[PDB]
Amino acid sequence: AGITGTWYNQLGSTFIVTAGADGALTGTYESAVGNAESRYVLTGRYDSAPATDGSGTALGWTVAWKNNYRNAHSATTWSGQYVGGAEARINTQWLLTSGTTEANAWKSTLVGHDTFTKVKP
Amino acid sequence: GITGTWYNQLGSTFIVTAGADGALTGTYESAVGNAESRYVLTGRYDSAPATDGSGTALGWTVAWKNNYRNAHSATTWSGQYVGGAEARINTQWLLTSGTTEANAWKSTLVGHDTFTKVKPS
Amino acid sequence: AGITGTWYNQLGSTFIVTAGADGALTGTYESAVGNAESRYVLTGRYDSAPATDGSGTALGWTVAWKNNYRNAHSATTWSGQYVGGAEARINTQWLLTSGTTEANAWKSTLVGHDTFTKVKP
Amino acid sequence: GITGTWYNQLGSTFIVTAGADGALTGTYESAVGNAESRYVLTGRYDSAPATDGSGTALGWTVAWKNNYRNAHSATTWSGQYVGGAEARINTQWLLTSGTTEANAWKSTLVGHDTFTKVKPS
């Protein structure tokens, strides 16, 4: 699948990803330091039998920003596709939802994008 | 409050298990509950939400591949669980399809879903 | 076109819209009180020759949240389609971008949805 | 700083006029500048941004109809202008197509654009 490994976004984040034979994505977000206080679980899914016509591999994953040290009361989901080859990428759009009161729910979800590469920018 | 069967008003059912560790697992099911339309979901939620009336942040992914069908796509939902008398999961979603590089710009749809524990009539 | 008139979202907002023959959308956001302090200009575009196959009319508009009284340093864009008939609607997704420092730009854009009707909820 | 010609790295040109009143007007142009590919843009921007290093919030819409072509669609861009040595407009976009009611759920694509005043080679 080409997805298992360490991935870097363009803005100082690291993700350790494992792609299981069944379509499972597992792993962690890690800080640049790699310390336990900044480590969070990721879980998601990917297409384990992509098209053989040059198409990318659809996927998504979530991190809830709680570990045994910190809780931001929020969760990010990334949706995108893996593209293999010499310039392998995961191109994604993300949504970050924060836990809010009902009055503030309308402004609970931020949107953005991330591009993941196998080496640093 | 998250564990159980969630419905939108547009024909979808999700049977969700919320684990003590922050794991979301379960399935998408069609209205007829057939194996060909059943798909794995996995995600994460805040297992220690704020105690100030805020919702519980969460997200999950389904890759639309099972042993029968493969749409070469994946949906991620980002949102929050709101408890009380009329419990809800309020979400926004991204649907990414596997595409060629030329079509990657138009690979991600956006929308929203509102889920209830009450099966529609 | 069926678009000119007063429109209400589901959450206490009013928009006064004019659809020009050339594809122009003009008008204002108005508060429930209709006072000048809460009035802001909207401008956008719509498809002035939609398909005749039951399809909706694509459109979009922007409000920058500055008037002579107030400035939130932000702007909302709505993207969607008008659907005519007895239950006429404008179904939209929105993005709200706030002016931020470069360090906070990643969290400058909120996403949501609005449904507009010709009468109050 | 907004008035002028803006380019992405993906073949698009926008000639934007920022009026003293907060109006954005102008055109999309193709790389060959032909009339068949020219479309009106209109939007709004914050004409009195914060003086603390924050960007200038803005948005605009193009409905993809002119006297030659009609795609039955419209794009909205939401973002901010950032001045200085390498001025940019950083945006996220929504593209809504006119659809039947059955296809309305999949009528809106999401993405991002980064614009510069420097024409690509």
Residue numbers in the entry:
A (entry chain B), C (entry chain B): 15 to 135
B (entry chain A), D (entry chain A): 16 to 136
Please quote the paper that reports this structure.
The same stepwise evolution approach was followed to identify hotspot D-amino acid sequences that bind to streptavidin. Two 5-mer hotspots, “wqeea” and “lanvd”, were selected for the extension step with all 160,000 possible combinations of D-amino acid dimers. All D-peptides fold into a left-handed α-helix with one turn for GyGlanvdessG and two turns each for the Gdlwqheatwkkq and GGwhdeatwkpG peptides. Gdlwqheatwkkq and GGwhdeatwkpG share high sequence homology; further, their conformation and binding mode are highly similar [Fig. 3(C) and Supplementary Fig. 7(A)]. In the common “wxxea” core of these two peptides, the D-Trp forms polar contacts with Asp128 and contributes an edge-to-face interaction with Trp108, whereas the D-Glu shares a salt bridge with Arg84. D-Ala is critical to the core motif because its short sidechain perfectly accommodates the limited space within the pocket. The positions “xx” of the “wxxea” core face the solvent and therefore are less specific [Supplementary Fig. 7(B,C)]. With the exception of these flexible loops, streptavidin has a rigid structure, with a root mean square deviation (rmsd) of ~0.5 Å for a superposition of all atoms in the co-crystal structures. The Gdlwqheatwkkq, GGwhdeatwkpG and GNSFDDWLASKG peptides bind with the same N-terminus to C-terminus directionality, opposite to the binding orientation of all other peptides.
